[PDB]
Amino acid sequence: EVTDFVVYKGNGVKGLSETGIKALPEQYIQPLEERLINKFVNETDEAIPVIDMSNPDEDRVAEAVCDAAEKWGFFQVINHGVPLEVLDDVKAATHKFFNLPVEEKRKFTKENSLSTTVRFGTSFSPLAEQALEWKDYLSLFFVSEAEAEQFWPDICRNETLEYINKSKKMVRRLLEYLGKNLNVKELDETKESLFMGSIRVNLNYYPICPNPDLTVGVGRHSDVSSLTILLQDQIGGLHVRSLASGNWVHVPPVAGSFVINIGDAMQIMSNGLYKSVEHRVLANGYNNRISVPIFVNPKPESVIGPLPEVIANGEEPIYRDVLYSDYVK
Ligand code: NA
């Protein structure tokens, strides 16, 4: 139907959006409860914690992260150390990829990509008979720089690699914070595979939508990551459900900012201390948007479970130890 143009012929929702369609197809019309929160107007005051990492006493900034991570499951960082040059080469390379001729982006579909670690796809849905999301993406699972050379798009490889390169030390800082109340004062090599074992990065593009209220960019969900890290563009559109009020908060795209949330893996290993919370992506009817999330994960064969350091003081374990790959599968 419309599936043919979008999916089977690989135009995606961007090229479909570029046909100037005045009306949204049935495939993307989200359920009622999704369309209700789209029409939910907000509280004029509540917001996600903003943390300045350039602040000297590094032990107040430490307990700020988990004053954020325990109650909100979400926070933003402003002076994180990743040079702002890199954030704006990668957001460009994202655009120059999606603005590539279609003939060349068909090369990274599940059928045409010469590696499964790379895949350009469109209109996602976890389940069958379910509404699809108004979104195109390029999912990049990191193996090596070698497998980047051979399988990553040349028009956006170096920017992405460099963006991983620079982000990964900020990540190390954040984790060695996080261990605070988890009684883990130094990052070691077994835990490094439990937290930063595997890395995946998506290049997201959200084209302008004719009927923004019927669909979403991303449906209600919690990341299964250890933690994510979100680089938004200047419109943004992240929507987070609070644990205090229970309402939904629109997250403001700050000058030179990352949005870090929390994943199932961290919640499990923290024995429920950290919260992996629900969040959406709104559809915008006026502008095209992009998004470059990094998904920081355990290794696929990592057996995660409550860290021994969290259960030693006579607390009881809330979770089984489970294989990570069997969990996401
Ligand atoms: Na997410």
Author numbering: 15 to 343
The publication says:
Recently, the actual enzyme involved was identified and characterized from A. thaliana and was designated as feruloyl-CoA 6’-hydroxylase (F6’H1)10. The product 6’-hydroxyferuloyl-CoA is converted into a simple coumarin scopoletin via spontaneous trans/cis isomerization and lactonization. The activity of F6’H1 is entirely dependent on the presence of 2-oxoglutarate and the Fe (II) ion. Sequence alignment showed that F6’H1 contains the conserved Fe(II)-binding motif (His-X-Asp-Xn-His) and the 2-oxoglutarate C5 carboxy group binding motif (Arg-X-Ser).
In this study, we determined the crystal structure of F6’H1 apo enzyme by molecular replacement and also generated a homology model of C2’H structure. Diffraction analysis of the colorless plate shaped F6’H1 crystals indicated that they belonged to space group C2, with unit-cell parameters a = 193.22 Å b = 54.55 Å, c = 78.82 Å and γ = 111.5°. The F6’H1 structure consists of residues A15-A343, B15-B141, B144- B344, 28 solvent molecules modeled as water and two sodium ions. As expected the F6’H1 structure closely resembles the structure of the A. thaliana Anthocyanidin synthase (ANS) search model. Like other members of this class of enzymes the structure contains an N-terminal DIOX_N (PF14226) domain, residues 62-172 linked to a C-terminal 2OG-FeII_OXY (PF03171) domain, residues 212 – 312 that contains the catalytic site22. Strands β1, β2, β10, β7, β12, β5, β4 and β3 form an 8-stranded mixed β sheet, which assumes a β jellyroll fold common to this family of enzymes. Sheets S1 and S2 together form a large (2,309 Å3) hydrophobic pocket that contains the catalytic site23. The F6’H1 substrate binding pocket is contained within the C-terminal 2OG-FeII_OXY domain with its dominate feature being the 2-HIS-1-carboxylate facial triad (residues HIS 235, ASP 237 and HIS 293) that is involved in iron binding. However, in the apo structure reported here the iron site is occupied by a sodium ion. Many of the key residues (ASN 218, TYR 220, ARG 303 and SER 305) involved in binding the 2OG co-substrate are structurally conserved in the F6’H1 structure.
